[PDB]
């Protein structure tokens, strides 16, 4: 139907460009999260 921007809320475990310092809270697109951050150990998807 209408494209709905997917929003994954995450914590950064290392510092990455444009994102920020280690141990940081953010919200991201699903593609960015699962295809880039997550395989490289860089981020962690959070649902407490």
């Amino acid at each position: 139907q209408k494209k709905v921007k997917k929003i994954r809320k995450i914590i950064l475990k290392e510092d990455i460009p444009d994102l920020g310092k280690k141990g940081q809270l953010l919200d991201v697109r699903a593609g960015f999260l699962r295809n880039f951050l997550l395989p490289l150990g860089k981020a962690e998807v959070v649902t407490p």
Partner: protein, 77 residues
């Protein structure tokens, strides 16, 4: 086959219908992708054909839940 292992999706049997009401056999297919998925508990990727719904579900429940319900060992994959 055009089948997702994980959700067991099948191609669906459907009539294409014209403005004239004239019916025709047709196939709607599962949306299948050749994807690599990260497996954290294996520290490694797995090549799979997946439905997109399956990809979703893997985001939601984590890969291992899904593969355990579908009974498919990530090792033999």
């Amino acid at each position: 086959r055009r089948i997702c292992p994980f959700t067991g999706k099948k191609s669906n049997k459907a009539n294409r219908v014209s403005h004239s009401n004239h019916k025709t056999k047709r196939l709607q297919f599962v949306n299948l992708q050749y994807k690599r998925v990260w497996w954290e508990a294996g520290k490694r990727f797995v090549k799979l054909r997946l439905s997109t719904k399956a990809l979703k579900t893997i985001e939601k429940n984590g890969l291992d839940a899904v593969a355990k319900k579908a009974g498919i060992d990530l090792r033999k994959e």
